[PDB]
Amino acid sequence: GSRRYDSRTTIFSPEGRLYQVEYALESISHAGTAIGIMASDGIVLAAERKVTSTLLEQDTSTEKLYKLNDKIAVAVAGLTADAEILINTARIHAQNYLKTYNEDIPVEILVRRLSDIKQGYTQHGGLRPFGVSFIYAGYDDRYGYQLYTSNPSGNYTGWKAISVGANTSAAQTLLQMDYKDDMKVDDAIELALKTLSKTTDSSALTYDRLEFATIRKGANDGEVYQKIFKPQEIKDILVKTGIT
Amino acid sequence: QFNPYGDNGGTILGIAGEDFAVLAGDTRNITDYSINSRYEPKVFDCGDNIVMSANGFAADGDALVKRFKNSVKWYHFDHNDKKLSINSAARNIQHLLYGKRFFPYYVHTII
Amino acid sequence: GYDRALSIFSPDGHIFQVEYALEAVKRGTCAVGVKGKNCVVLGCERRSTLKLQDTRITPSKVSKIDSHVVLSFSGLNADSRILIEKARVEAQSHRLTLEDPVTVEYLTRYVAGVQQRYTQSGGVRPFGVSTLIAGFDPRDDEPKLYQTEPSGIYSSWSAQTIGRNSKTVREFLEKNYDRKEPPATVEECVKLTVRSLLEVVQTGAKNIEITVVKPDSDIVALSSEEINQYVTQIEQEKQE
Amino acid sequence: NNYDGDTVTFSPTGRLFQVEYALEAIKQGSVTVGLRSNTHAVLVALKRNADELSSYQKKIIKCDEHMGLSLAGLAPDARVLSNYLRQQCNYSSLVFNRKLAVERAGHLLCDKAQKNTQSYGGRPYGVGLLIIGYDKSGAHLLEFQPSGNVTELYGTAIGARSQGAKTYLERTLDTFIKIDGNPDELIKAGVEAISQSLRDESLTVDNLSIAIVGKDTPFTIYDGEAVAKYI
Amino acid sequence: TGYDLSNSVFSPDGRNFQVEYAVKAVENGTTSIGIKCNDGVVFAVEKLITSKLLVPQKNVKIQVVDRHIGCVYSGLIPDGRHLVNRGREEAASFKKLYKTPIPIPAFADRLGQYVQAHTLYNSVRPFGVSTIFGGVDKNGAHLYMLEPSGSYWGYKGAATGKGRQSAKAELEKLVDHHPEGLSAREAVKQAAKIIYLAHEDNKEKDFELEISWCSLSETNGLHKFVKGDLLQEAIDFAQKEIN
Amino acid sequence: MDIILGIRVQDSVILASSKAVTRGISVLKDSDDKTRQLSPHTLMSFAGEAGDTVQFAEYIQANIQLYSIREDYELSPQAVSSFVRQELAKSIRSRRPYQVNVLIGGYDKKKNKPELYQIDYLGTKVELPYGAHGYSGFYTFSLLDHHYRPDMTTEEGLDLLKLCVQELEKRMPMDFKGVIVKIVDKDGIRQVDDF
Amino acid sequence: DRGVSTFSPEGRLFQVEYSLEAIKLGSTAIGIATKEGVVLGVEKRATSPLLESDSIEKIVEIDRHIGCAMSGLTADARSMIEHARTAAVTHNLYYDEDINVESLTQSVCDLALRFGELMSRPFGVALLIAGHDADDGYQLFHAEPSGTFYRYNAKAIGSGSEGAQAELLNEWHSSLTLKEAELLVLKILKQVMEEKLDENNAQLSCITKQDGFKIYDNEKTAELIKELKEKEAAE
Amino acid sequence: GYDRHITIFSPEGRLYQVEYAFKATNQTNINSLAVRGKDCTVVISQKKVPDKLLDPTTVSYIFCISRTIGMVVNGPIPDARNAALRAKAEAAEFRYKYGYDMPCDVLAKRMANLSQIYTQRAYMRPLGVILTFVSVDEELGPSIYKTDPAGYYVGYKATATGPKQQEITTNLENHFKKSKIDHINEESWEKVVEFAITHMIDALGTEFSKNDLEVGVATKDKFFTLSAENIEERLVAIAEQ
Amino acid sequence: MTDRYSFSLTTFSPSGKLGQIDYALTAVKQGVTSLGIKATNGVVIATEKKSSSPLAMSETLSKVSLLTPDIGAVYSGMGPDYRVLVDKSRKVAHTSYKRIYGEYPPTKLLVSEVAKIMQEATQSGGVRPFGVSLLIAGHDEFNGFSLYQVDPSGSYFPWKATAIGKGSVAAKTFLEKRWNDELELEDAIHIALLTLKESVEGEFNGDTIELAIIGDENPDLLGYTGIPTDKGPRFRKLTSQEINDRLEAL
Ligand SMILES: [Mg+2]
Ligand SMILES: [Mg+2]
């Protein structure tokens, strides 16, 4: 019958790896680089759009950076359509928690459930895994500012600074060299932009090839603000850190 | 309004001696003030030296006996023709009866 | 629904998907359990290439299943979360119906049953995880340590190790663990657990996690400095 | 070859290889014989043991007071098919107060077997059955193959080396079909038939299995010391 | 290649090879025929006597559907039984909702659609039978033959199985000698004759003859098996005609 | 079963619950504890239909204990009360609803405050300085309306509780057999053995 | 690939034959039926010396009058044992009696072929089921993943089964006492085991009508091992 | 190469099973033609009964889908009858749900959608048939809509299907270049049937007897087929031209 | 029966490619050119009507479809796949938006629902991806005019102007030379007609070209009067004559 055409998406290789997870990770290694950096007073997410065109409408464009709620954002590396499926699931999950407990969802709890959904696709059902790696940036009143990543295996880990997509090996070396614990948000902004500048496969890093966002305590005391940067605001911060 | 029960009268009687037992019953079957039959047997040989009567609403009584007789047959099939002891029969009938706990067989049973 | 028999027999009588699940366990970071006279210590390796990691928030390798039992593992991290969640639910369910917390053997038997089930159900692959489950039964001071594997067999151990280079550290435990005289204290037990990992690890830094469990729901994870004190003591003692 | 992967595939010459492979398990099974007169129907079977410490596997299974069968091949598949028969015999008695005709039992087995030869995921049954019975039209003997084909016969045999017994019954037909009102002479004829399938091994007390059904004879099985009479 | 390993796959020339292989099972079977007459239909089949041990008259192949339809088939016998069971459900359901017994053209399409359904998926195999069937309804007599593809047409006469070529040639001569019509009684005799002629292509073992008929005048539009004297008379006519 | 009271003072929540269990014409038990510890700093008392009270309370206790293990963290009393209210609001439109009224007393260690929530069986939640379920509120609310102060100590809360229990013992038709009193504060939950 | 329910050209189910190969790799189990009871014994085979061998549980109670030993993929046995216990207890509930040993075995064997694309594969474990009932006395059965079960006077399964069965074929006779059977199980396990047999790497059990199913202490077995080396020394 | 066995894309973005289904369409070696008049729609198809044992009245590839809609099929009869039964069910259900007769173009779209699904879901094969639906629609007037195994459909002035379709197509093209209109300018369907037969004769280069054709006609509120006698009447009239 | 294809037919290859999506895009490459251009006061979408037979009536086959009163779509690739996406697109606009908020969805959210439908054909059991790329043009009160491209993978991008299909590489280059942020709708239409001529070798007129706009509200196309705040559809299909009138000024 149909058994003939089944690729068996959820089996081990003789070395004990999941082929489809490995191949999904190979797909992600060609996507635009996304970087996350955590400071004591905020978080930075910065991501490279994959070689754009001059006719693309950038201000209404969103391919890398998404809002999950008022306190949690994600940077995406992989198939955007796969990512949107997961993002909407995560948005609903956050709202269910708020409805149940009357408290905003703690960051790890949102991350765990999304990673469990990905894990499920590697173990049962015979469907292809999601070709997506996430960087989660968020705040809650237990751990403060937090960075996590998840990938198609549904494994997640926490970071002071991390990258996903293209050139993560080079990016991770550069982050390790310059990162320090007492670092502030404005220092992390410069670090993220400079790391992308050195690792990019493009001729030069310009405002039109970027998405940028911060999560800051910047407001009226003990309250957290998510700023997704408009194209002109990315252009300014590129001049202000001497990259263009 | 449909009432799924009736009453067919009749009286049954079981007595145990030292090395024997008897099960007796009248053969009249009735509804209200009418006689349906002057000879409608009510006590049955079910095999394995067991006799049974399920008295009251005769449709339920017949259904139960039928199910128990069938249970003796399958007891032989499933357990290499072992004889069904009277204590084992009694316990089996409890499950046949309690299985319809929320829509009972309207009978008083004696084996 | 997806129904395919992924775990099946091959001509030599082996189930390859279960054996390949074992290969995944071999690639996992090393884990070790040693039971003292009135304690159990679970030690875990953390990889050396993960700096810039935030240790405040990153998933710890030793998990409380209830207040008196812990679980560690080697293999796929994502797979282990599914086993830990089920174990946590079963432990609360056990307290709800029996009015008593699970024994360590009961909890182990539950997890291993779940592991076995996934080796002969349609449409699923086995777990790429082996576990060490340690703790104390309610109102009992005898320490317990069990091991489970992808196939679903489980058993009790005086001391055991799983994951990469476990052959080496099992070798060490087999010639340093005396059954007639188990580690008599918490200090002694931890030291033997750290000694065994220094055979395989690299640095006594954030590369070693240690969780101690004592009778009557007394479980605590050691800090870097406390663990580092043990490493310093062991280096100096090996100068002859 | 390229066409024997499953039951749902014809070969280029119109064969069903999984069904033919199921027929092969019947050929490896121990021999069993059936034959009938106008008053009685008889089964005889050679039972097989694992070694000298083991029991001899039972070949004969009762389906009702008036019907039963013997098997050759996968014994668990006989258990499944005889159970279905038992329920069908039982349904007929409970609902219609009617003893299931042997011919009807044959049709019901055929249709049940056939469903597993035309759908993906299934496999054919790996057992052959000889059904005997006595109903409103007298004695009957049926042969069932897991291809679905059921045949009514005076006598037959299935299992390894059954061609000897089959040849013998074909030569003896005119004589045994007339053994009426003499159950013992009909059985002796069946034991003669099965002896033509023996090579090296011979009939012993825990080797031989015999069953009979007839005019005033409920389906009954004889094993052990109850068959000594015929050795 | 590999276009023939799985049902419902089109080959590069638009064929379904699994259905063509199912036809091989049909061609391997015994000969069956149907003859249409003035007010009815006649069916006949060759039954190979494998061994003397087969009880004569007791392995009936021709099957009835409802009270007015006869069916016969060649190929895998169990597939035929499966198809007739489905036909009986279709006839009962029609009768239940519409009161009138199912007309023959209506019945033909019910079987046709069900046989065609088994050429649509790889999870089933095609039927390994060709079925000849018909009967009498409110519009008179109808005779049909249905292939493993699900294809069916109406017929003046029909044949299938191993001796189909001889039978077809023989049926065509019948239609020529008797152009204004054939009675139900000559049709019974002619069916015996044709099965006997068709049995030369299977001369190995000898055989048993089975005949059935539905006729307005002769059976009141009900399906009946030809038995006893009328069958013996048909056997004689056949014997006399071959020599 | 019958009476449950709660009062939040300066630094603690005091819960008092009657001890009688009464079936028909017989008092079956005079030492029943109508409470479950949900977490180290959260206590739930309950009253309502028989069987359902304890079944509901233990089901809640199991879920909060499951949460605590999974996150290695104690949910705030506000979060527990919202979870409990949702279960009751879910239940009121079930085939057979839980007929249970509860008081939840907790000390919020993050805010350093005691908190008292009253939730009826429909899922009607309110945060109050003092609360009660059933007929007990008809006698005790006016006492508490008079005497209660927000800066009261634990000892003052217990004396105010004595007035309430005395009024109930005087005017209530039923013999509820005294109360078990429990205090929830920063150090956890403890039982006042002499009341 | 191919279907899980495929017949080979010789008329055998591939998966069932392959599961029999996994059973050949199992540790040895021996059973011996006498008129005074049935003895069940097994090789424990701890894979490392730090494994606490009394946690190796290859002999199992099904009911007071029925015990069972296993060999092969022993994790597969747990759901079979669970079914057996439920079948024995359920029978007692429906019938106020003990269930026959053969009916219990048949119930376990009905699970065997319920695999396909039901469970995904056959069981990779064989059982020896020993017990007593009033109609047929003391009984030993060999339950296989083919769904077939044979009654035996004596039977060995697992890796040492070829050599052990040859030995049982000589030693078994209808008048064996229970004590003689115990010694005989120890002797034959001693022969086929790789390591030297002691009270920690082998285990005994039995079922008698009077006392039901018992797993022997290590001290009770230790005494029986000493008794056996003394028997062999005397000629 | 198992991309050739089910409806998934080949490396060149083709669906081979759909293409092979288009080839099954010609297996019967019948040619059909449809044209529109002022007040009617006519379809003609060749009829071939090679076997003398067949009842020729049951040999047909024209179907009465509803009282207003007719359908001619090019392809094997089993797939044709499958399509016909479904279309009958769809047309009747539409009338029940929406209270008016299902239009010809709307049925065509519906049947094309089912066919699209067979090109996208693996478990279903395409039907190896082309379906030409005709009617006189109460809104659109005379209508011809044709559906194929790719799930494609469109309306036609006139159309032709079968192995010798191109011969007929170019013949029809050359006629509408002369006339410069969308239809056959004629009152009676009889003369439109005569036009259709005339132009099939001239394009195929063959003569037809009354048993060589089958004819369907759609007029306002009914579609019907012609008997062999009605066709003979039509053939006679052509001969006198 | 039963659909027993409960497994994915699109899977990752060792290089990380999803083969079926790549092949679907190849089907789109071979399709007839379509394009869209955004102006200050409207949007235009256009494509060639590549008629299959001269006997076919090409106005019975629309490549440009109204999805909502202010949203339209065009495609390149497989037509039948497009036709069923339009059915589902029209329906999801009602079930997941209009029946909830009592108003039509904004362009980006309808595009998002179509995208989801297309993503699912790439992961769900027993299906292949859709062999089309869509251009979806629309207007809504709070976002103004917009133009989106949706691909077989489910990805979608906002464009100032773009082309898809056969001659898309040259057409995109042609559009980059001509586009600016001050274009009025009539200029955008004129550029749309110029761009499309480059890819049409045959006849080029109001009967071979299909063109639609999102522009001003058309109160004449509303069907009723009385409710002053209902002002009519912004979607409008240009007639054959309207296109011919603009080809003389070309
Ligand atoms: Mg309230
Ligand atoms: Mg398909």
Curated annotation (Swiss-Prot), chain C:
Localization: Cytoplasm; Nucleus
Coiled coil: none
Record-linked SMART domains: Proteasome_A_N
Miscellaneous information on this protein: Present with 16800 molecules/cell in log phase SD medium.
Subunit note: The 26S proteasome consists of a 20S proteasome core and two 19S regulatory subunits. The 20S proteasome core is composed of 28 subunits that are arranged in four stacked rings, resulting in a barrel-shaped structure. The two end rings are each formed by seven alpha subunits, and the two central rings are each formed by seven beta subunits. The catalytic chamber with the active sites is on the inside of the barrel. Interacts with CIC1.
NCBIfam families hit by this protein: PRK03996.1
Protein name as catalogued: Proteasome subunit alpha type-4
Organism the protein comes from: Saccharomyces cerevisiae (strain ATCC 204508 / S288c) (Baker's yeast)
The encoding gene: PRE6
Curated annotation (Swiss-Prot), chain D:
Record gene name: PRE5
InterPro entries assigned: Ntn_hydrolases_N, Proteasome_alpha, Proteasome_alpha-type, Proteasome_asu_N, Proteasome_sua/b
Note: Present with 7210 molecules/cell in log phase SD medium.
The keyword ATP-binding is assigned to this record: no
Entry protein name: Proteasome subunit alpha type-6
The keyword Transmembrane helix belongs to this UniProt entry's keyword annotation: no
One GO term of the biological process aspect: proteasome-mediated ubiquitin-dependent protein catabolic process
Entry function: The proteasome degrades poly-ubiquitinated proteins in the cytoplasm and in the nucleus. It is essential for the regulated turnover of proteins and for the removal of misfolded proteins. The proteasome is a multicatalytic proteinase complex that is characterized by its ability to cleave peptides with Arg, Phe, Tyr, Leu, and Glu adjacent to the leaving group at neutral or slightly basic pH. It has an ATP-dependent proteolytic activity.
Binding partners and assembly: The 26S proteasome consists of a 20S proteasome core and two 19S regulatory subunits. The 20S proteasome core is composed of 28 subunits that are arranged in four stacked rings, resulting in a barrel-shaped structure. The two end rings are each formed by seven alpha subunits, and the two central rings are each formed by seven beta subunits. The catalytic chamber with the active sites is on the inside of the barrel.
Subcellular location: Cytoplasm; Nucleus
Crosslink position(s): Glycyl lysine isopeptide (Lys-Gly) (interchain with G-Cter in ubiquitin): 188
Swiss-Prot record, chain E:
Post-translational modification: The alpha and beta forms are probably products of the same gene with different post-translational modifications.
GO cellular component: nucleus; proteasome complex; proteasome core complex, alpha-subunit complex; proteasome storage granule
Keyword Transmembrane: no
Keywords associated with the record: Acetylation, Cytoplasm, Nucleus, Proteasome
Subcellular location: Cytoplasm; Nucleus
One annotated GO molecular function: mRNA binding
Main subcellular localisation: cytoplasm
Keyword Nucleus in annotation: yes
Disulfide pattern: none
Single GO BP term: proteasomal ubiquitin-independent protein catabolic process
Function field: The proteasome degrades poly-ubiquitinated proteins in the cytoplasm and in the nucleus. It is essential for the regulated turnover of proteins and for the removal of misfolded proteins. The proteasome is a multicatalytic proteinase complex that is characterized by its ability to cleave peptides with Arg, Phe, Tyr, Leu, and Glu adjacent to the leaving group at neutral or slightly basic pH. It has an ATP-dependent proteolytic activity.
Quaternary assembly: The 26S proteasome consists of a 20S proteasome core and two 19S regulatory subunits. The 20S proteasome core is composed of 28 subunits that are arranged in four stacked rings, resulting in a barrel-shaped structure. The two end rings are each formed by seven alpha subunits, and the two central rings are each formed by seven beta subunits. The catalytic chamber with the active sites is on the inside of the barrel.
Shown part of the complete sequence: 6 to 248 of 288
Swiss-Prot record, chain F:
Phosphoserine found at: 76
Alphabetical list of SUPFAM superfamilies matching this protein: N-terminal nucleophile aminohydrolases (Ntn hydrolases)
Gene3D superfamilies per record: Glutamine Phosphoribosylpyrophosphate, subunit 1, domain 1
Keywords associated with the record: Acetylation, Cytoplasm, Nucleus, Phosphoprotein, Proteasome
MF term (GO), any: endopeptidase activator activity
GO process annotations (BP): proteasomal ubiquitin-independent protein catabolic process; proteasome-mediated ubiquitin-dependent protein catabolic process
Domain of life: Eukaryota
Residue numbers carrying N-acetylmethionine: 1
Subcellular location: Cytoplasm; Nucleus
InterPro entries found in the cross-reference section: Ntn_hydrolases_N (IPR029055), Proteasome_beta2 (IPR035206), Proteasome_bsu_CS (IPR016050), Proteasome_sua/b (IPR001353), Proteasome_suB-type (IPR023333)
UniProt entry tagged with the keyword Lipid biosynthesis: no
One CC-aspect GO term: endoplasmic reticulum membrane
Pfam families: Proteasome
Major localisation: cytoplasm
General remark: Present with 21800 molecules/cell in log phase SD medium.
Family designation: Belongs to the peptidase T1B family.
Function summary: Non-catalytic component of the proteasome which degrades poly-ubiquitinated proteins in the cytoplasm and in the nucleus. It is essential for the regulated turnover of proteins and for the removal of misfolded proteins. The proteasome is a multicatalytic proteinase complex that is characterized by its ability to cleave peptides with Arg, Phe, Tyr, Leu, and Glu adjacent to the leaving group at neutral or slightly basic pH. It has an ATP-dependent proteolytic activity. This subunit has a chymotrypsin-like activity.
Full protein name: Proteasome subunit beta type-4
